[PDB]
Design a protein around this nucleic acid. Structure first.
Ligand code: MG
Ligand code: MG
Ligand code: MG
Ligand code: MG
Ligand code: MG
Ligand code: MG
Ligand code: MG
Ligand code: MG
Ligand code: MG
Ligand code: MG
Ligand code: MG
Ligand code: MG
Ligand code: MG
Ligand code: MG
Ligand code: MG
Ligand code: MG
Ligand code: MG
Ligand code: MG
Ligand code: MG
Ligand code: MG
Ligand code: MG
Ligand code: MG
Ligand code: MG
Ligand code: MG
Ligand code: MG
Ligand code: MG
Ligand code: MG
Ligand code: MG
Ligand code: MG
Ligand code: MG
Ligand code: MG
Ligand code: ZN
Lengths: 98, 78, 155, 60, 127, 24, 206
RNA sequence: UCGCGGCUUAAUGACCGCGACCUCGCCCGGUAGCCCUGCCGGGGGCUCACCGGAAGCGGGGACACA
RNA sequence: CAGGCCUUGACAUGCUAGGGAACCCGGGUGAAAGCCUGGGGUGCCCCGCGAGGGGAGCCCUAGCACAGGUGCUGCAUGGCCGUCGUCAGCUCGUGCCGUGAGGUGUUGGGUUAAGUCCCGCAACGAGCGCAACCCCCGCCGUUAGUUGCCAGCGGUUCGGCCGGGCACUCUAACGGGACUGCCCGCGAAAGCGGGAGGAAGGAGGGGACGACGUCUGGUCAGCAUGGCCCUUACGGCCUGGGCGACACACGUGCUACAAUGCCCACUACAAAGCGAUGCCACCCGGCAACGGGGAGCUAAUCGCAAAAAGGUGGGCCCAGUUCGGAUUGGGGUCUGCAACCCGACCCCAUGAAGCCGGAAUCGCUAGUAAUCGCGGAUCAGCCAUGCCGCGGUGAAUACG
């Protein structure tokens, strides 16, 4: 039915922010689908490493947005109680939409 | 290029239309080279500006659908 | 390579003949990563073979490779003063490469104009003995074996 | 001329083509990123310090 | 029912489903030789069944995906073998004299900065 | 070849579209 | 043209990002501007307390600006008022709820961003340079660490030729990813130039 | 966190013995926000986040939900 | 660079101070900047129905310290980097030897990618290096399924489109797996030659990683910075030009010089990506670039998007040609205030040099070379054939 979507950067806090939410909406009523790890979005960008004259042999960085969604299937007020109030990520953008 | 504009200037256009008042003087010192030779408003010699000075191009009917910057050549060694 | 033996890339067996000489000939025909056109050229070439001569599609080609296969080939070695051009006998695992490369060069320089008929008229004349590739073989086996005077450098 | 230009990048009451983006920490006018806004040098010395979240030395 | 197998090669993947079936194969809702139409190496994919010599018993529905034609062909060449190995003890020890179960992970190797195609260094002045 | 602007491959190399390389 | 930055070499593993937050292309540049400007306020104007790092977070409009200080006695205030005025300063450049959590270090010599600053204070206080280096490494080992290395770069000792002096006690395994070598860097802005103090502190491995 | 002796030191340490203390309440007093029938003003709840007066302080060094 | 101009100035404040204090609207001169210029005129500190006055932000004037410098110096420097070179090394503690510099350790034979390891040894250890710890790509498993597939009665807009549903491919976490692990031959041991099983072999393949230091390497023009120099100019603003010029020379690439090739049509087959003032599906118009509607997308959901090479069957017929696409003229579309210097494309003419290249030289040891397209960055457009990535087809050879 309704989805909650979790972007962010560190997956090691993201999975502990998502499996917590799976456990919380389990503990607050009926069942909800697990963490569906839809693919990460890798913003790569390259940089001539030295400041002046070093075009060959340069460095490049990556920026991995980790997206993970959870499909809430029966949204009771009991679910919104321990879900929409009890919002605790740390650097993770959660967004709740149909 | 450029089929949706007359691409003449808000000061070159004003000066040539004011100098076409029944015939008038000849000095018009422009800096904006980008403007075209104002079609059916030829005749007055314009001092275009290649950067070093003002070259006084006498504009003729064979040069009407061109720009003013063609007649201020910007370099030596043709 | 310098350190190790540098073992050869094991090829594939071919499809329609199941042979290993023919795949190296596909590779020597193959221009700029175009094997689906190169082996296409070879199978049109054996079609022209079956049209012209009542032989096998593979036998005239294998006998052409054998009758272009060199034995004594000349290699240069600088031995002071004037760099001598020493003859030496060739491993068959290099004779196959030299033979197929000569076949492709002489077939591409061969004065016919279409792809597979150049190889057709080249494999016919090389299996006969009067082709440009066997001419090049006799050229190098007359460079060597008449350049036999400096053969005491085996290296 | 860079203390002029790092404010000329701010002010635009004239035409909107002259809004070239300039770097944020330094004042470089080349290789400034439509992401972060740092140039490539400020990007390298902030990605190595760790003041950009998510960025990381890449190897794929 | 399904003698299923996986298969993947060179970022071309393959889901082979060997049927108990008479004599044909198919691919992705198309005919076999209308998918691989006129490749001289097209029928190099079916080379498991012509060498487990079990060709006269099996159909193969195939969803093959990604990569290119001759990458998908080698994906099928792995797929038929890894599919018919699965329901079998003795269709297994055949491919070690064939190589027909190894993904062959020679992939298109990653381009390196300075070079052009991960090995091709630029031309060299030295002057 | 590819530097040409009035063919198929000469337009796919320049990237754009035209009478010689159309849009479907 | 060597030795990449041993924070950013670790950065994915064994080491957190010093500013961790999130948004896409819309507000990443706009967050990074205020995230640099907060640090340009702090590191310029909190240096007397000796701040090591400025861990900056925001979940949603809760800017945790938690800093790492050796001595919070001039970044909090007597009972706390410099913390108050500094939070009303942090409100002036970003309007959000800028919760500034000062956090002290567990040993102010196992933190390379303050050892390097202490060496920089010695150079700007005109002390003997290699005496300061071989003292700072010894004070790090008496605090107790697995290995240190204080590279101090050129114009050293008021000279004209600019050699680089350094001293180590213990092991500094830079190329080992699991090592957790903390790294600090601090300029020294005395009369004879810019003395660039670096310091590596090899903490517990794995 | 600061004086005085020393541990510890090279200036200086981190650490001890008292002292100038602190804030938090166990010691006291006031201010102020809501939870609401949608709009404010009159009874409870007590919360000191804010602040003055504090007997020893239980403590640590300079901070904060209901 | 040329010209118009501004001066404590685009700015950072901080002071003396009549003034206006937050600020909006224009007119004229002008290439613009600038300069000259007229109409509305401030909650608050306030004592205020008072005249008002001290006086708090901000702003303009006259000044002040000063700002500013892409001015010089990378042999004054930091920072960062290229480099020798991912090369196998450089050292130290202690002991010994040597008057000492300095050995020794680190030599020797063996061995590897390696100063890697073992056996002897005045050495015994240790540090930075190597290796490994990290990541991708390999296989397998657990979790998870708005991607994914017909296995299922079966609807059927007759379509992955759904109705049933996740089997898989996948996705991205967490795990396992490969270690000489086994066995044989050689070997003092390390290890080497081979075999088996495995998906994989003896660093499985690639990344990131680059020691002590050298080149007084490069950068004061990314920044920071000592010093000296400019301070109504070397600073600042703008308009226009230049950075694109061209007698030639060089370096790197791109297309070519063709029939394995070229042109038209048609049908396939990718990963990587990137997009709310953007991507633009799908129509209409225009041969076309594009233009006018407008769907979807806050994106594994919609879009760029066509993939190209391939394949299909039609043309060309060894021709400077239906090779080549440089040039020049014309018709135009977009961006942008502005395409003349100098943008990109579209179309129609033009059709040159060039028929595999001197002496020399470079690149490459496996998905590599070669050939083919695609994406991204910066970005209004774009110089892009470049760079950074992605995949498609995919070789020959390494005797030594
Ligand atoms: Mg001689
Ligand atoms: Mg061979
Ligand atoms: Mg621009
Ligand atoms: Mg490639
Ligand atoms: Mg043509
Ligand atoms: Mg289509
Ligand atoms: Mg001085
Ligand atoms: Mg003034
Ligand atoms: Mg000098
Ligand atoms: Mg330097
Ligand atoms: Mg020594
Ligand atoms: Mg002695
Ligand atoms: Mg070693
Ligand atoms: Mg490996
Ligand atoms: Mg120099
Ligand atoms: Mg300077
Ligand atoms: Mg300079
Ligand atoms: Mg600067
Ligand atoms: Mg100037
Ligand atoms: Mg230039
Ligand atoms: Mg070239
Ligand atoms: Mg063509
Ligand atoms: Mg993009
Ligand atoms: Mg429209
Ligand atoms: Mg996407
Ligand atoms: Mg995708
Ligand atoms: Mg033209
Ligand atoms: Mg050539
Ligand atoms: Mg020569
Ligand atoms: Mg691209
Ligand atoms: Mg360029
Ligand atoms: Zn920058």
């Amino acid at each position: 039915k309704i989805r909650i979507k979790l972007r962010g950067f560190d997956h090691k806090t993201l999975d502990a922010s998502a499996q917590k939410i799976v456990e919380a909406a389990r503990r607050s009523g009926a069942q909800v689908s697990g963490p569906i790890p839809l693919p990460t979005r890798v913003r790569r960008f390259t940089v001539i490493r030295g400041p002046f004259k070093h075009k060959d042999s340069r460095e490049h960085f990556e920026l991995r947005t980790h997206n993970r969604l959870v499909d809430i299937i029966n949204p009771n007020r009991k679910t919104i109680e321990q879900l929409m109030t009890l919002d605790l990520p740390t650097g993770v953008e959660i967004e709740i939409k149909t | 290029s450029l089929k949706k504009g007359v691409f003449v200037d808000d000061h070159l256009l004003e000066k040539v239309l004011e100098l076409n008042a029944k015939g008038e003087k000849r000095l018009i010192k422009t800096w904006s080279r980008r403007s075209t030779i104002v079609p059916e408003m030829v005749g007055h010699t314009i001092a275009v500006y290649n950067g070093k000075q003002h070259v006084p191009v006498y504009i003729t009917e064979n040069m009407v659908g061109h720009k003013l910057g063609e007649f201020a050549p910007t370099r030596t060694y043709r | 390579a310098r350190r190790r033996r540098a073992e050869v890339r094991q090829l594939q067996p071919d499809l329609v003949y199941g042979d290993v000489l023919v795949t190296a000939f596909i590779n020597k025909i193959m221009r700029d990563g175009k094997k689906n056109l190169a082996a296409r050229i070879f199978y049109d070439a054996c079609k022209i073979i079956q049209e012209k001569t009542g032989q096998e599609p593979l036998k005239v080609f294998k006998q052409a490779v054998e009758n272009v296969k060199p034995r004594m080939e000349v290699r240069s070695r600088r031995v002071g003063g004037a760099n001598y051009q020493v003859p030496m006998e060739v491993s068959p695992r290099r004779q196959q490469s030299l033979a197929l490369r000569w076949l492709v060069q002489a077939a591409n320089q061969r004065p016919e104009r279409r792809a597979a008929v150049r190889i057709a008229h080249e494999l016919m004349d090389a299996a006969e003995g009067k082709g440009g590739a066997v001419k090049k073989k006799e050229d190098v086996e007359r460079m060597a074996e008449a350049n036999r005077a400096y053969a005491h450098y085996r290296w | 001329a860079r203390k002029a230009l790092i404010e000329k990048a701010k002010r635009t009451p004239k035409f909107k083509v002259r809004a070239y983006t300039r770097c944020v920490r330094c004042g470089r006018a080349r290789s400034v990123y439509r992401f972060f806004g740092l140039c490539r040098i400020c990007l390298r010395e902030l990605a190595h310090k760790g003041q950009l979240p998510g960025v990381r030395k890449a190897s794929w | 029912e399904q003698y299923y197998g996986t298969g993947r090669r060179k970022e071309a993947v393959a889901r082979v489903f060997l049927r108990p079936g008479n004599g044909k194969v198919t691919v992705n809702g198309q005919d076999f030789n209308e998918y691989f139409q006129g490749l001289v190496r097209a029928v190099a994919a079916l080379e498991p069944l012509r060498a487990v010599d079990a060709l006269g018993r099996f159909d193969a529905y195939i969803t093959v995906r990604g990569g290119g034609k001759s990458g998908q062909i080698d994906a099928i060449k792995l797929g038929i073998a890894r599919a018919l190995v699965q329901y079998n003890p003795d269709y297994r020890a055949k491919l070690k004299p064939l190589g027909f179960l190894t993904r062959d992970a020679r992939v298109v190797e990653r381009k390196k900065y300075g070079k052009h195609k991960a090995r091709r260094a630029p031309q060299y002045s030295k002057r | 070849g590819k530097g040409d602007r009035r063919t198929r491959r000469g337009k796919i190399w320049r990237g754009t579209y035209g009478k010689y390389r159309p849009r479907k | 043209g060597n030795k990449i930055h041993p924070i950013g070499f670790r950065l994915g593993i064994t080491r957190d990002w010093e500013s961790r937050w999130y948004a896409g292309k819309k507000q990443y540049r706009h967050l990074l501007l205020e995230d640099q400007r907060i640090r340009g306020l702090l590191e310029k104007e909190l240096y007397s307390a000796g701040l090591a790092r400025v861990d900056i977070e925001r979940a949603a409009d809760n800017v945790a600006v938690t800093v790492h200080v050796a001595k919070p006695g001039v970044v909090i205030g007597r009972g706390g008022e410099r913390i108050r005025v500094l939070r009303e300063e942090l409100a002036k450049l970003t309007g959000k709820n800028v919760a500034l959590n000062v956090q002290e270090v567990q040993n102010p010599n196992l933190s390379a961003p303050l050892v390097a600053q202490r060496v920089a204070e010695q150079i700007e206080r005109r002390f003997a340079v290699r005496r300061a280096i071989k003292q700072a490494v010894q004070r790090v080992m008496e605090s107790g660490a697995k290995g240190a290395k204080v590279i101090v770069s050129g114009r050293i000792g008021g000279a004209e030729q600019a050699r680089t002096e350094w001293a180590a006690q213990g092991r500094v395994p830079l190329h080992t990813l699991r090592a957790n070598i903390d790294y600090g860097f601090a300029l020294a802005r005395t009369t004879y130039g810019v003395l660039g103090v670096k310091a590596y502190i090899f903490l517990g491995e794995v």
